[PDB]
PDB file of C-alpha atoms in Angstrom:
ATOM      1  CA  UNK A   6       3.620  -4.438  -6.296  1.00 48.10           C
ATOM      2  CA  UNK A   7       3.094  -5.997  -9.732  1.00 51.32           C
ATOM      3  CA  UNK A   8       2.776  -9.384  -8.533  1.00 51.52           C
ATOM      4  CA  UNK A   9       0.508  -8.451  -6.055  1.00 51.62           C
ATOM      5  CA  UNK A  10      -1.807  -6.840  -8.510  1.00 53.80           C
ATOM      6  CA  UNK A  11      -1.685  -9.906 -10.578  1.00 56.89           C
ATOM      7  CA  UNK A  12      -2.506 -12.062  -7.583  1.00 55.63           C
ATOM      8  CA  UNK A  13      -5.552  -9.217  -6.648  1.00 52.85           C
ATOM      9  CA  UNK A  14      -7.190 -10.592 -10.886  1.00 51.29           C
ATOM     10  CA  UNK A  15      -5.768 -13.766 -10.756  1.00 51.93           C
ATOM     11  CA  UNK A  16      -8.403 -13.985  -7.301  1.00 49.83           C
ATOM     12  CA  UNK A  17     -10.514 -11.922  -8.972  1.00 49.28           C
ATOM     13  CA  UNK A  18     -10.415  -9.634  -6.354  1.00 50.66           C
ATOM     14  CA  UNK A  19     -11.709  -5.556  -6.845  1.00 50.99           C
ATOM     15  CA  UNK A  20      -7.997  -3.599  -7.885  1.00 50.78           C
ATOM     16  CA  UNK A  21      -5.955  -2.171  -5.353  1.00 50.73           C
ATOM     17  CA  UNK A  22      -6.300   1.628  -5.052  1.00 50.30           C
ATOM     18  CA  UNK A  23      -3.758   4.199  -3.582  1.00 49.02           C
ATOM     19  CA  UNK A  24      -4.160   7.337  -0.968  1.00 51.44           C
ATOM     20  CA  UNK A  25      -1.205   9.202  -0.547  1.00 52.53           C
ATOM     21  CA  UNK A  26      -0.754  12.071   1.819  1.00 56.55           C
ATOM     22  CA  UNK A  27       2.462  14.353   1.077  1.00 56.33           C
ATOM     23  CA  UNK A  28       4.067  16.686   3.106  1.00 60.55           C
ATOM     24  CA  UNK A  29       4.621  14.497   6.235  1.00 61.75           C
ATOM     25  CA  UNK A  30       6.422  15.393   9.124  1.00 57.59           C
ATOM     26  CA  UNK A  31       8.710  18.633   9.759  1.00 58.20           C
ATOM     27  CA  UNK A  32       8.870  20.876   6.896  1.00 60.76           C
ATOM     28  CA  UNK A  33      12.653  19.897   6.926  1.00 60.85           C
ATOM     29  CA  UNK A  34      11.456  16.238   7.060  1.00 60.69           C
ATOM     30  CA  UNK A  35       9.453  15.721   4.104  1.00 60.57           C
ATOM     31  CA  UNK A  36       8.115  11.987   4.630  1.00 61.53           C
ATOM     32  CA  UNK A  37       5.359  10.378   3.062  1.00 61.82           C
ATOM     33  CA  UNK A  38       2.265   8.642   3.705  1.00 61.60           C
ATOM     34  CA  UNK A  39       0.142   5.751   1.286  1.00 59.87           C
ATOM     35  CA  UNK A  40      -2.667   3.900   2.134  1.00 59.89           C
ATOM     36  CA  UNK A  41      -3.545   0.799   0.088  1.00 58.20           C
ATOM     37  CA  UNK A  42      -7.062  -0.422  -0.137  1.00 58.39           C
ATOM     38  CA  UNK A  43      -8.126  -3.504  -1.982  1.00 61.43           C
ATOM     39  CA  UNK A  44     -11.570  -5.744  -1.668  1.00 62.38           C
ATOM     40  CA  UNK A  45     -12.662  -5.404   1.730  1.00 62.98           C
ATOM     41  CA  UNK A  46      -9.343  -4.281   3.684  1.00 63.92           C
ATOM     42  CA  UNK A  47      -6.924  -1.720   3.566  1.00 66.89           C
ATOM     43  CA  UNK A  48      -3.395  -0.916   5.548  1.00 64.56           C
ATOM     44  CA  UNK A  49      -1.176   1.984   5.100  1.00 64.83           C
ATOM     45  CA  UNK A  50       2.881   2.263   5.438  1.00 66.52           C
ATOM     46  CA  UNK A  51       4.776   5.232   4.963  1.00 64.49           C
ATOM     47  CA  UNK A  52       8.363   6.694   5.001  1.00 64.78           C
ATOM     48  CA  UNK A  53      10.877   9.268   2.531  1.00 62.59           C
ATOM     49  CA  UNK A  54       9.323   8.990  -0.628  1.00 61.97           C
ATOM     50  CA  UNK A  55       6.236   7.933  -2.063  1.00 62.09           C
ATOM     51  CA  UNK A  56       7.886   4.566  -3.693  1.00 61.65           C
ATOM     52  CA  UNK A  57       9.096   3.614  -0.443  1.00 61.47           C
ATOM     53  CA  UNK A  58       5.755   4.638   1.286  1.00 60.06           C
ATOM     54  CA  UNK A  59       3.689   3.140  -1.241  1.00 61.89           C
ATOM     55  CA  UNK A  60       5.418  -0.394  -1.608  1.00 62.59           C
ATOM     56  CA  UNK A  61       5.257  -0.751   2.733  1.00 61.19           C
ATOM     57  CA  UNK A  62       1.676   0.236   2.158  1.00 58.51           C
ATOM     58  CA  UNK A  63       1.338  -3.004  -0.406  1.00 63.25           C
ATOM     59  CA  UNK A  64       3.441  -5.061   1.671  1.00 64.25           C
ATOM     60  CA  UNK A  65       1.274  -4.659   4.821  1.00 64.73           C
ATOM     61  CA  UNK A  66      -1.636  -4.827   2.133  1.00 64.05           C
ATOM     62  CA  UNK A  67      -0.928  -8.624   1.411  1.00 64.95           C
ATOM     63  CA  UNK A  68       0.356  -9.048   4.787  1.00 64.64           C
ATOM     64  CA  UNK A  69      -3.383  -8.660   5.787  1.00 64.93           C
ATOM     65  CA  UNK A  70      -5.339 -10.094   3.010  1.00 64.63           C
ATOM     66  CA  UNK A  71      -3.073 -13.136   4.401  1.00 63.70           C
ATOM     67  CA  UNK A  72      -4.301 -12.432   7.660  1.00 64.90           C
TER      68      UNK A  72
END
């Protein structure tokens, strides 16, 4: 996620900003959900924790801005 953040200023693109949503799923199944916005798009990922959900959410984030 670092490296895309210093992609986002070395474009100087607006900085990526994070939404996550906790408490996903069954109440057995905690999962969670991030979505990751940055300059004019955004894309969310999700999963069992918030570093997993939030790095998916970054990875689909580039994914697009490469779109």
């Amino acid at each position: 996620i670092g490296w895309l953040q210093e992609m986002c200023m070395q474009r100087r693109w607006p900085p990526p900003s994070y939404e996550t949503e906790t408490e996903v799923g069954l109440p057995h199944e905690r999962l969670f959900t991030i979505a990751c916005s940055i300059l004019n798009y955004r894309e969310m990922g999700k999963g069992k924790s918030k570093k997993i959900a939030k790095r998916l959410a970054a990875h689909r984030m580039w994914m697009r801005l490469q779109e």
